[PDB]
Structures are given as structure tokens and as C-alpha cells.
């Protein structure tokens, strides 16, 4: 597109939105300013600050009650008669009022300098009539670190940064860079962050306010501060425990936030040539600017290259590959949709006959004091119950599709679920990653059934400690871990409270897979590969650098089982390991 229509065709989209000129010139008075926002982002502050800058008056009404509707009608009438502005917040909660709002907007001729601002989340309930009527604006997290810092510096007023002392500009630049990194990391979930936190503009406002407060506390009107006298510890602790650490759930995410803060908020006491990150491993780094002024920092921000790798964020370079490929094929599908405008039950029965050949039966293996034996007994019992229910349902579906059986309510619901291809609610007993399809769920079920058959045959003949277990094929793996701990404690007459875990690559656990790392003689090393398969993990319970890694139940990293400890290599860095999101998975 650059070589077809000029290199500056999409350059204005990376810049912050200039709402003042667009509102003052482009928008007709009878056209409402529709301002859609993605969830987690609010656009009310933009209009409030715009009206403050333009020295106008706005009646902000929160839509959602009858007196709110009456106040909105009165304010709209008064603004049409006089010429002020009217803002209605959260209008997506009343399409049945938005319709006649649109009708009364087109039925009236307003004053010249009158604009109506409608703020709503991106929802299908918004009337298409109002969407065609108004001027649509979408509000999204800015794309790219450069655009994020540009938006931050445009949001922060100049008079706030330029106040004494002179280190406030550098501190604000550091804060903007930190906010840009930790807001850009949300896109590459779950590697960047284990959850989708709402690191919005309110956190940035609170961080700027606390930076101003602590700098004013430290400096009694002095023109400059030595870099050793800045409250670095106060800023780090307060932003890790109150502002940005408020929404942090996991200890691993808290550790990542602490690593980022301790790496970014010392700068070797404002020393020159401070490396912000490592863009490319081969002879490429991002350097802290040496300037002292806000204008110099803005000029440095605008001089950032248009290219951007995920390694700017501390993530591995291949973190954006799958998402970027999916976005490309989505664009292709969108274009195919654009140029598009310019029995079944026999196959269902064939699929139902195809699936159940991978499932045959299951034993049951009932009075023993061995914790491992009772754990495997209850696991085998649950698996046998699930297998019996699934096989009976499959046979009933085969009969009602071709045979002598009528369709009941439950059978019809199962038919609908199986035709749509999603998992029925009855079969979903154990954990499933983010709603996997029935095609993969049947294969996972077959693997679990085969593993439980192997366990039952081993228990039919201690003879149970020597088996190798796949951690991803169990209904509950934390129960297996606690059963192993109980077994070793009862066998060696120890105390359950004073037992720790050691990892070697005397219990064998299989199926554990790394994420962006490799193992060699029980020494971790960073790798550019997406995942590496650990051949066999050995667990030894004993009474009494090194990194701590999570062992997540699936690729979504929504369930935590236990934490491992692995020896790091002689050349790597635990901070790099925490920043790149190295974790361990048990299934894939």
C-alpha cells in the first residue's frame, strides 16, 4: 500500500487522534459524535479535557434510569436552544431510547455550535439507525510502543512536566516507557501476561500523580535533584503494590512486574548509555536518550523506527508469529467476504460410527491404606463412569439416527450439540482448555482412557511406584502430587509440612513441556523454539542461580498445579527468564 499510494498514506493513523479540529469543523451540529470504545477503555476523559481546553460547558448524564432520560431530554433541549454541549455516557444500555433519540435528533434543527457526544461499548445492541446517523469514532489501546508513548505525552500537559526540578521530565519518560511496555504486553497473551489485565489510563494518571507527589516531597523547590536522592524505592514499592500491582493476581505476574520495575527504575542513577531493551540479539539495542527536556524526549519518541519486534517488550521474537498469521488470514477472509458481494444425519451417523472405536472398556481395580492406590482407584472409577456415560450416549444417538428409538429432550439436545460440534455440557467433567472442540476432546478422552487402562493393568500386577504417569492425562494432577507426598511421608515416617520438591530430568512424571527454553543436564537455557518436550521428569521429596517456574495445566495458563525449581546456566539471567515468560506445560 505504501508503494501504491505513497509512504505516508497510513501515517496519520499512528498519530494521536486530533479531536479538536474534527469536532469543530467536520461534525455537523445535528450529527451526534458517536464514540465507541472497546471494553476496558473509556473515552469520557478525552471529551472532558477537550471541553476544559475549549472552555465550554457540558452536562454529562449517565444513561440508564428514567430520571437520567428526563435529564438528557432537558439538557438536549436547552443545548439546542442555547448552544452548549451535551454528553450522554453509556448509551448502549438503552437501544429502545436511542431510537427516538435518533428520531428527535433528525426532527430538530440545532444551534451551530452544538455537539452531542454518545459514548458506548462496542455492542450489537446499538441501533443501526443511530450508527448511520452519527459520526463513529472507535477508541482502542494504541498500537505500537511509539504510538503508545506519543498518546501518553499528548495526554500529559506540558506545564505539568516542565515544572521544577528538571529530572521530572526523565522520570515521566521512564514512566511512559514502562506503561507502554506493560500495555503492549497484553496483546501477546498468555506469554506477556497470564491474564488480560485492565492497565488503562487511570493507572497512568495515578502513577503520574504519585511521581509528582513524591518528587515534591523530596525537593523543597530545588531546581535539580541528584539521581541518588530520588525516591526510587518509594516509587517502585508504591507502583508495585498499589497502582499497577492492584490488578495483579498471580505471584508470577507480580514477579514479572517487580522485575520490570527494578530493571527500569534505577538507570544506574541516570547514567548515560542505559540500555532500555534488546531489539535484536545481533548488534541491536535501544538506548536511553541523553537529553533533559520534554521536547527532546518527544523528539526521541518520534524518531523511533516504524519496525517493531516483540523483543522490544522483553518477549521472544516469535511471540507475534501465530497472531500475525491469524490476522493475515483474517484479512484474506475479509477480502473474500468483500468480493462475495461483487442427508446431514447420514453423515452425522457416519461420524458417530467412526468415533467410538477408540474406546473399548475400563476396569475398576477396594480396601487398602496406600494413598497412591486409593487415588488411582478413584481416578479409574471416575474414568469408567465417564466412559460408560459417553458410550451409552453414543449408542443412543446411533439408535435415534438409524434404528428403533425415539428422540427425547436430552437426546435432541445432544444431537444439536454434536451437530454444532461443540462440547455438550454433560460430558465436560474434567478440565478443557478454553472450550476445545469435540474432535480433539474425543482424542483426549481416548488418550486418558488408554492411560487409565495401563494404570489398571499395572495395579492388577511396590508395583505402583515404578510406573510412569502422564500429568496431562489425569482428571486432577494436584491430587496425584499430594498423594505422592503423602506416600513418601508415610513410607519414611516424616512430617508432611516439612517436605519440599526437587526436579531432575523418585517418581516419574511424563508429558511435561517447556515454553521457550531447553534443558541440558538439568541446566536451563533460553531458546528461540516455541516449546521443547521434556523426556522424563523425576520428582524426589526431601526434607531439605536457580529460577522458579510455573507448571500450568494447559496452553491457556489458567490453572496452576505446582512450581518447579531449575538450575540456570552460567551465562543466562533470571530476570531475562522471568521477562520472556518461560513456563512449563503438562499437555499440548
Amino acid at each position: 500500500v505504501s508503494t501504491n499510494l505513497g509512504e505516508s498514506f497510513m501515517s496519520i493513523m499512528e498519530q494521536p487522534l486530533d479531536l479538536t479540529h474534527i469536532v469543530g469543523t467536520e461534525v455537523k451540529p445535528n450529527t451526534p459524535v458517536l464514540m465507541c470504545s472497546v471494553p476496558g477503555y473509556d473515552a469520557s476523559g478525552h471529551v472532558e479535557d477537550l471541553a476544559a481546553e475549549q472552555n465550554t460547558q457540558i452536562t454529562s448524564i449517565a444513561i440508564g434510569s428514567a430520571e437520567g432520560f428526563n435529564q438528557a431530554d432537558k439538557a438536549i433541549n436547552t443545548a439546542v436552544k442555547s448552544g452548549r454541549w451535551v454528553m450522554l455516557k453509556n448509551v448502549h444500555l438503552a437501544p429502545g431510547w436511542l431510537m427516538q433519540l435518533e428520531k428527535k435528533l433528525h426532527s430538530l434543527q440545532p444551534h451551530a455550535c452544538f455537539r452531542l457526544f454518545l459514548t458506548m461499548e462496542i455492542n450489537p445492541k446499538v441501533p443501526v439507525n443511530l450508527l448511520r446517523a452519527g459520526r463513529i469514532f472507535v477508541f482502542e489501546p494504541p498500537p505500537g510502543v511509539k504510538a503508545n508513548m506519543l498518546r501518553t505525552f499528548s495526554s500529559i500537559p506540558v506545564s505539568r512536566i516542565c515544572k521544577s526540578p528538571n529530572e521530572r521530565a526523565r522520570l515521566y519518560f521512564l514512566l511512559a516507557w514502562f506503561h507502554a511496555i506493560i500495555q503492549e504486553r497484553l496483546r501477546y497473551a498468555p506469554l506477556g501476561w497470564s491474564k488480560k489485565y485492565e492497565f488503562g489510563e487511570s493507572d497512568l494518571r495515578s502513577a503520574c500523580d504519585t511521581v509528582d507527589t513524591w518528587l515534591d516531597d523530596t525537593a523543597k523547590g530545588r531546581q535539580n535533584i541528584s539521581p541518588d536522592k530520588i525516591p526510587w524505592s518509594a516509587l517502585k514499592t508504591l507502583m508495585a503494590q498499589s497502582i499497577y500491582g492492584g490488578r495483579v493476581d498471580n505471584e508470577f505476574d507480580q514477579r514479572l512486574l517487580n522485575t520490570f520495575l527494578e530493571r527500569l527504575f534505577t538507570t544506574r542513577s541516570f547514567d548515560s548509555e542505559f540500555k532500555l531493551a534488546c531489539k535484536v540479539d545481533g548488534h541491536k539495542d535501544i538506548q536511553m536518550p541523553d537529553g533533559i527536556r520534554r521536547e527532546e524526549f518527544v523528539q526521541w519518541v518520534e524518531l523511533l523506527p516504524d519496525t517493531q519486534t516483540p523483543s522490544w517488550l522483553g518477549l521472544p521474537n516469535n511471540a507475534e508469529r501465530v497472531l500475525l498469521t491469524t490476522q493475515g488470514v483474517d484479512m484474506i477472509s475479509k477480502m473474500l467476504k468483500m468480493q462475495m458481494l461483487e442427508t446431514l444425519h447420514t453423515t452425522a451417523s457416519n461420524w458417530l460410527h467412526l468415533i467410538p472405536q477408540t474406546l473399548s472398556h475400563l476396569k475398576r481395580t477396594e480396601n487398602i491404606k496406600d494413598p497412591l492406590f486409593r487415588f488411582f482407584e478413584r481416578e479409574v472409577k471416575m474414568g469408567a463412569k465417564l466412559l460408560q456415560d459417553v458410550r451409552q450416549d453414543l449408542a443412543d444417538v446411533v439408535q435415534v439416527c438409524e434404528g428403533k428409538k425415539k428422540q427425547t429432550n436430552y437426546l435432541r439436545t445432544l444431537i444439536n450439540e454434536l451437530v454444532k460440534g461443540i462440547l455438550p455440557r454433560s460430558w465436560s467433567h474434567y478440565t478443557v482448555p478454553a472450550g476445545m472442540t469435540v474432535i480433539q476432546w474425543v482424542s483426549d478422552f481416548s488418550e486418558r482412557i488408554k492411560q487409565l487402562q495401563n494404570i489398571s493393568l499395572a495395579a492388577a500386577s511396590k508395583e505402583l511406584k515404578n510406573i510412569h504417569v502422564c500429568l496431562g492425562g489425569l482428571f486432577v494432577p494436584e491430587a496425584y502430587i499430594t498423594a505422592t507426598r503423602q506416600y513418601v511421608a508415610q513410607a519414611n515416617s516424616w512430617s508432611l509440612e516439612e517436605l519440599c520438591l526437587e526436579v531432575n530430568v523418585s517418581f516419574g512424571v511424563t508429558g511435561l513441556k517447556l515454553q521457550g527454553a531447553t534443558c541440558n543436564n538439568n541446566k536451563l537455557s533460553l531458546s528461540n523454539a516455541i516449546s521443547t518436550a521434556l523426556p522424563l521428569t523425576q520428582l524426589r521429596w526431601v526434607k531439605q542461580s536457580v529460577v522458579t517456574l510455573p507448571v500450568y495445566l494447559n496452553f491457556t495458563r489458567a490453572d496452576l498445579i505446582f512450581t518447579v525449581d531449575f538450575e540456570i546456566a552460567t551465562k543466562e539471567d533470571p530476570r531475562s527468564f522471568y521477562e520472556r515468560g518461560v513456563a512449563v506445560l503438562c499437555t499440548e
Binding site: G64, A94, D209, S242, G246, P371, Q486
Partner: protein, 811 residues
């Protein structure tokens, strides 16, 4: 005054019914005999007409209630009926003692004299009393709002003066390394619990500040704190009165928190008081040279300074200052400094509402807890907000996410108005709420409690999310809270017991079978520890009936079994027993010693045509399940007899109620309410959008009858059973009843406290729809399907065939 001018027809009706009641009292004083009183015909019709006219007068007189509320700020927290009773009984005075619990934080009653014309002081619900320095005189005949404002101001001044005297006394204690337990105990008995804890905090803060002003002084401070903790433990290890035991427990908790903080400070090297390692901790400062007695104490945090509200809180419960609680205090304090409301969130049972309440009590501020539901409208929210604005208290809205998204967005405007008013106050200040200007006190605070993803609850709008500082809290310090609470109750191996009981619950939560009625979290742990303390005190009393050493392991295992065994299915009993035997090698177990209740249960079962068992007979499982239900009535509040239909869980609690009546001599009354036969609106009550009048639902009306106790309901034993299936549509309105608050909040704003003789029970069948916030607050009694064997039903049918003839010796 000027009653006759505003309501002429109402005053005419009042005069008519006054003449009718004068005739009634004349004719009842003419003849004192009840038969002679009943001799007059038409007395029932006259009473009906009088009641109807009284109801009409009360209904049409309600417009003056808001005007009366406008004068005294605390009047917003009481209902129409009891506010009218307060206004009518203004000269009665002695009747108002039962209505101060809603007006004040901990003032359950006030102290008067024989002349009933001067207020000597105030008293809490636990017998703690505050003697006023200068009593307020009603002999001047002021108005009710005037002398209530005077008594509130005098209470605050008296609390400040007592705190100043107490902190001077503690300062003269702390100058010596060795301390006298007799003098310490006399000081503890001299000063109230809140002031004692405050004085200890101020003394420790001043000592650490002087040490950091300057190694050796910090070591001296830590040594003094350790010596004080040793004296505390030695004094708790022996027999104590209940109130003094609670004061000693609060002191133990705060002193062990201070010891932990000082040890953390001395582990690193701190040289100046401006270091953030010391500024991040909660600090207290007292200035004796300050002229204003109210502003003598300043409470500080990281760049956030607060004054003490000096609101009387009675005794209450002090939390354990875990590091998570410290982080929560820091976050909420920063939010309050930035004039933003706080909003902790997370799974239920992590201690959010209690953390907010503990912070509000630490700052000495009135806190109100509302379990808001879908019926909390904009008008109700505005009413409680203007009440909070006038009184200058805190709000602790629990379960904010179930608030009808459009109404949530509407409430966001009022919240923003409050924030703007507070920021204007931070630099005759008012804000517009419900189209009215209301005075806003600087002591404002609005707090939000959320459990995202609970039962598909609604989500906040972004303009409301930006007004609240979020705080994630998911894993509380279970080991620390268990250790501190056990050491506070008094246990030689307290640390060992906590380190054995916390990983036991961690193992038991993920080893047992996955059932929908299982809790193994912080609420269950706290219930187990409280039961352990109570049973340890009971065992000590039983032994001393005949110092010494006691089997603390046996006591803890007995409490664990007593609280956790009944909720288990038949499969999980051997698993939990093996887990207990693995955690505690010399564990052992015992039960029984309930011969009187057992034999009376046998008598009632034989009377009502049941089958009995001695423990191993045909009825033994049902009998021991009844005994387990009795134990959980003893040690719990909310009960849930879970089990399949046909497990005898109705006859079990019926025969238990009858047997308990036969033992204690206290008559038992049972109310059976079906929550699904009627709608939620009819069950709890309606709020009319036209005129803000609140009618009574079934459960609310039953609770009001029990509270009012016209026919002597506090003396009896009232049991409310919800015979129906459970779902978070209606049961989430009871999560404050089953909490530490023990009260029910209505949309009209009034608070219905729960009397100690009422247990709220359920007779549910399945738990496939209730949430963890409901399952956590109740103690399960799992009635398995094998509890009621079929031969028991056969014998019951045969007995009912042999007796009770069908056409009800006879043929």
C-alpha cells in the same frame, strides 16, 4: 411543633382517636376484672377501627420523617416505624435504648440516673462502659436532635481524653525494661479495648521513631516488645474474665504484628525515619501540646495523613495483620488520599469486607456494610449516600457487581459527584444528590466488594471503574493468621499447631472428592480455630473442676472432626481420617458424652413413632447425624441439611428441636418458608417507585416479629428453615446475615440485626447452583441416602398402622 398547621385532617383524626382511646381507658379502668372488660360488646370492632385509623394516620404522617432526618445526621439509618416510635417516645427516653445500635457504631445503650434527666455515659453490647467527663443535661429540656448531638460530641471528647490519659500511662510504663503484670492488668481493666490497642500502637510508633532518629535503640525496642509479648502470653495462659480475655487477645495480636514489623525493619539496615521501609508501615503520632483534643492523634501512611474519628466501637473483633492485609491497607489508604473509593476484589472468603471494616475501625470511623442486590435502585442509593454524607461514615457495599448495569451506570454519576465534592474539600461545602444539595463531611469513604465471575453477575461500566482503585487479593496468609490466632487464644505449641493445620486443609481441599457443598478455605479455618479455642477452654474448666498440661493436639483434632466430619460424604470419612492420622501421628479420637440428650431423643422418637439406634443399631447413623446437627447448632449460625430427598433431614431437625426443648425447658418455634413458592420480591419485600414506602416480605416480617418480641420471642428458640432448593437469585441477600455482621440490609437503608437465639437453616437437596459465597458461610450436615434405611420406614409405617386409627379399643 406546628403539627396542627401542616396536617389538619391528620390532626382531626388524631383527636378523634385520642377521644376514643380516652373512652377506652376510662371503661377499662372502671372495671379491672378481665371478665368485666370482656363483658362490653363491640370491643373487638372498636379495637379494629382504632388500629385501622392508627395505620392510616401513620401512613399519611410519613412525610415528616425526612424532615426529622434532615436535622440530626444519624437519623438516616433507621426505618419509618422505629423512627416514629423514637419521636413519639422522646420523653420516655428509657425505651430508646434498643434503637441506638443502628444509630451508632457500638453504642448499644446509654447510661442514665434515677431522675432520668442526665446521661451519665454510654455502654456497648458486651458490658463495656464509658463514663462521661462532663455529662449532658436534659433538665434544660432541649430537643432530641440537640441533646443527641451533644451526647455524640461529648462521647468523642471523652474518648479523646481517655486516650490521652491512657497513652501517658503507657509512656510511663515503657520507660522500664522489666514490667509488672499486676500493673499491666490493672491498666488493661482501667481502659477500654479500643483505647488500649490505640495506646499500644502509639507507644510503639513513638519508640520506633525515636530509635530511628538515632542499631542499639531498635534492638531495645524489639526486646521491649518481646518482653511485653511474653507477659501477655503468661497472663493469657491462666484463667481470665471474658472481656479482659478479649482485651488481652487484641493486645497479643497487635503486639505480635508490631514485633514482626520491627523484626523486618531490623533485618535490613534503616538509618533515617524518611526511609520508605518505615514510611510504608502504619504509623501513629500523638501531640500533647495540641489545643484541640479531637486533633491530638494523627494516623499516617505513605504520604497519607488521617485523623482519628473517635467513634466508639465497643470491643468487636481484631483481624490478624497479615502482609496481604498490610498491602490492602496501603492500597486503600492511597486511594483515600487520592480521594478515590477503594474496591478490593477476588474469590469469596479472602477477607475483603472484614479488611475494609478493620481499616475503618483502625481509623476510628463508622462503617456500614450493605449486601446490595438487583433491587437497590437509584433512589435507594441516593438516600443511603446522602445519609452517609450527613453522618460522615464509611460505606462497604458488598457484592456490587449484582446491581443491574443501567442502575450501576446511574449510580456512577452520584459517585463522581461525591468524589468531586471531596476533592473540593481537600482544596458550607455541598453536592447535588437526588436533586438536592447535601452537606458532605470530610470523613467520606465509599468501598466496593466484588466477586467477578460468581454467578454470571453484571460488570461495572468503565466510567465507574475509573472511580475506584482496584485491589486483587486471592491468597491470604493462612499460616500467619492461624499462628497468631492460636497464640492469642493461648497455646504452648501454637506455631506447631498452625504449621500442622494449614497444610492439612491445603491437602484436604484438593485430595477429597469434588462435591458442591465443600469449603476448606479461610472461613472454615477460622471456624475450626474458634471452636478449638472454645473446646480448649471447656476442657480446661472440666479438668480444673476436679496450670497443668493439656493435649492441644487432641483439642485441635477434636475441633477439626467436630466441624468438618458432618459435611463429608460416606466415602471421604476414611480419607479424612487417614489424612488426620498422617498429619498427626499420635492423633487419637473420642466422642459421645451426650447421654441425657441421647435418652431424651430416644423418648421423643418413641413418642412420635420413629426408630432409634444406639450408634450401631438400625437407627444409629440417623441418631449420630442428629447429634452432629446439634453440635453444629452449638458452634455455628447457618446450617444446610444437604442430602437426597428421603434421608430423614426433616424428622431429624424436628426431633432435635423437640429434644432440645425437653432438655433446656425453652420452647422451640419453627418457621418453614419455601423460597421458591413465592417470588423473591414477595419473600423479601417490595419498594414502591411512586412513594418510597417499604412493605415486609415473609422472611423480613418473621425477623421483625422476632426482633420486636411482643409475645416474648427472644426468650424462646426460633429456628427458620428454608425448605426449598437454593440458587444465588435470593440466597445472596443472606450473605451478610451469615457473616460476622449478623444483620440483614434492606433497600430502604435500615439494618436488621439478628438476635443470638435465631438460627437460619436450609433443607436443600442439591447444591449444583449455589455459589461459594453461600456454601462458605454455612456449616453443612450431609444427610446421605443410606442414613434412612428402608426398614426404619417400614417400622414407622407399622407403628402408625398399630396406633392412630384411620377414622380420626375401637374396632
Amino acid at each position: 411543633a406546628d403539627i396542627k398547621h401542616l396536617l389538619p385532617v391528620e390532626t382531626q383524626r388524631f383527636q378523634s382517636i385520642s377521644t376514643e382511646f380516652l373512652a377506652l381507658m376510662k371503661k377499662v379502668s372502671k372495671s379491672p376484672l378481665v371478665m368485666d372488660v370482656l363483658n362490653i360488646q363491640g370491643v373487638q370492632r372498636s379495637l379494629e377501627r382504632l388500629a385501622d385509623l392508627l395505620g392510616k394516620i401513620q401512613k399519611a404522617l410519613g412525610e415528616y420523617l425526612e424532615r426529622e432526618r434532615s436535622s440530626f445526621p444519624r437519623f438516616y439509618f433507621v426505618g419509618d416505624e422505629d423512627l416514629l416510635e423514637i419521636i413519639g417516645n422522646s420523653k420516655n427516653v428509657a425505651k430508646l435504648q434498643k434503637h441506638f445500635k443502628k444509630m451508632f457504631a457500638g453504642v448499644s445503650s446509654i447510661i442514665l440516673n434515677e431522675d432520668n434527666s442526665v446521661v451519665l455515659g454510654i455502654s456497648s453490647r458486651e458490658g463495656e462502659e464509658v463514663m462521661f467527663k462532663t455529662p449532658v443535661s436534659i433538665t434544660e429540656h432541649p430537643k432530641i436532635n440537640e441533646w443527641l448531638t451533644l451526647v455524640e460530641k461529648e462521647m468523642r471528647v471523652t474518648l479523646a481524653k481517655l486516650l490521652a490519659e491512657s497513652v501517658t500511662e503507657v509512656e510511663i510504663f515503657g520507660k522500664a525494661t522489666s514490667i509488672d503484670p499486676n500493673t499491666y492488668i490493672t491498666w488493661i481493666d482501667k481502659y477500654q479495648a479500643q483505647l488500649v490497642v490505640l495506646s499500644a500502637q502509639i507507644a510503639w510508633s513513638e519508640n520506633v521513631e525515636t530509635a530511628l532518629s538515632s542499631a542499639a535503640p531498635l534492638h531495645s525496642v524489639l526486646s521491649n516488645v518481646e518482653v511485653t509479648l511474653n507477659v501477655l502470653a503468661d497472663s493469657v495462659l491462666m484463667e481470665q474474665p471474658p472481656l479482659r480475655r478479649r482485651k488481652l487477645e487484641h493486645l497479643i495480636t497487635e503486639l505480635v504484628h508490631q514485633r514482626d514489623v520491627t523484626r523486618s525493619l531490623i533485618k535490613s539496615k534503616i538509618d533515617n525515619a524518611k526511609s520508605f521501609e518505615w514510611l510504608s508501615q502504619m504509623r501513629f503520632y500523638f501531640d500533647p501540646k495540641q489545643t484541640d483534643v479531637l486533633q491530638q492523634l494523627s494516623i499516617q501512611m505513605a504520604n497519607a495523613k488521617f485523623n482519628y474519628g473517635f467513634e466508639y466501637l465497643g470491643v468487636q473483633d481484631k483481624l490478624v495483620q497479615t502482609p496481604l492485609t498490610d498491602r490492602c491497607y496501603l492500597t486503600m489508604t492511597q486511594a483515600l488520599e487520592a480521594r478515590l473509593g477503594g474496591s478490593p476484589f477476588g474469590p469469596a472468603g479472602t477477607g475483603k469486607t472484614e479488611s475494609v471494616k478493620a481499616l475503618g475501625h483502625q481509623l476510628g470511623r463508622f462503617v456500614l456494610v450493605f449486601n446490595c442486590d438487583e433491587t437497590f435502585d437509584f433512589q435507594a442509593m441516593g438516600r443511603i449516600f446522602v445519609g452517609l454524607c450527613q453522618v460522615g461514615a464509611w460505606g462497604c457495599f458488598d457484592e456490587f457487581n449484582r446491581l443491574e448495569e443501567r442502575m450501576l451506570s446511574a449510580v456512577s454519576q452520584q459517585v463522581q459527584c461525591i468524589q468531586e465534592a471531596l476533592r473540593e474539600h481537600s482544596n458550607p461545602i455541598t453536592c447535588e444528590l437526588l436533586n438536592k444539595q447535601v452537606k458532605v463531611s470530610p470523613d467520606m469513604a465509599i468501598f466496593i466488594t466484588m466477586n467477578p465471575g460468581y454467578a454470571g453477575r453484571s460488570n461495572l461500566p468503565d466510567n465507574l471503574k475509573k472511580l475506584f482503585r482496584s485491589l486483587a487479593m486471592t491468597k491470604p496468609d493462612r499460616q500467619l493468621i492461624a499462628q497468631v490466632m492460636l497464640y492469642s487464644q493461648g497455646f504452648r505449641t501454637a506455631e506447631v499447631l498452625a504449621n500442622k493445620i494449614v497444610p492439612f486443609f491445603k491437602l484436604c481441599d484438593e485430595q477429597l472428592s469434588s462435591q458442591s457443598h465443600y469449603d476448606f478455605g479461610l472461613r472454615a479455618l477460622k471456624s475450626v480455630l474458634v471452636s478449638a479455642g472454645n473446646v480448649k477452654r471447656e476442657r480446661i474448666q472440666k479438668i480444673k473442676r476436679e496450670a497443668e498440661n493439656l493435649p492441644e493436639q487432641e483439642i485441635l483434632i477434636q475441633s477439626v472432626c467436630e466441624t468438618m466430619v458432618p459435611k463429608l460424604v460416606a466415602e471421604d470419612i476414611p480419607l479424612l481420617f487417614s489424612l488426620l492420622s498422617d498429619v498427626f501421628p499420635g492423633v487419637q479420637y473420642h466422642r459421645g458424652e451426650m447421654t441425657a440428650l441421647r435418652e431424651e431423643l430416644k423418648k421423643v422418637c418413641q413418642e412420635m413413632y420413629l426408630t432409634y439406634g444406639d450408634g450401631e443399631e438400625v437407627g444409629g447413623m440417623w441418631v449420630e447425624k442428629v447429634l452432629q446437627l446439634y453440635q453444629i447448632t452449638q458452634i455455628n449460625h447457618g446450617l444446610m441439611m444437604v442430602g437426597p430427598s428421603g434421608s430423614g433431614k426433616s424428622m431429624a431437625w424436628r426431633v432435635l428441636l423437640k429434644a432440645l426443648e425437653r432438655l433446656e425447658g425453652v420452647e422451640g418455634v419453627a418457621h418453614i418458608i419455601d423460597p421458591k413458592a413465592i417470588s423473591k420480591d414477595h419473600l423479601y419485600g417490595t419498594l414502591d417507585p411512586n412513594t418510597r414506602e417499604w412493605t415486609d416480605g415473609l422472611f423480613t416480617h418473621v425477623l421483625r416479629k422476632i426482633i420486636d418480641s411482643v409475645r416474648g420471642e427472644l426468650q424462646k428458640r426460633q429456628w427458620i428453615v428454608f425448605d426449598g432448593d437454593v440458587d444465588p437469585e435470593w440466597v445472596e441477600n443472606l450473605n451478610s446475615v451469615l457473616d460476622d455482621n449478623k444483620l440483614l440490609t434492606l433497600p430502604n437503608g435500615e439494618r436488621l440485626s439478628l438476635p443470638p437465639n435465631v438460627r437460619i437453616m436450609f433443607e436443600v437437596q442439591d447444591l449444583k447452583y449455589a455459589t461459594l459465597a453461600t456454601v462458605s458461610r454455612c456449616g453443612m450436615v450431609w444427610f446421605s441416602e443410606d442414613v434412612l434405611s428402608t426398614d426404619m420406614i417400614f417400622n414407622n409405617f407399622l407403628a402408625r398402622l398399630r396406633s392412630i386409627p384411620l377414622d380420626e379399643a375401637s374396632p
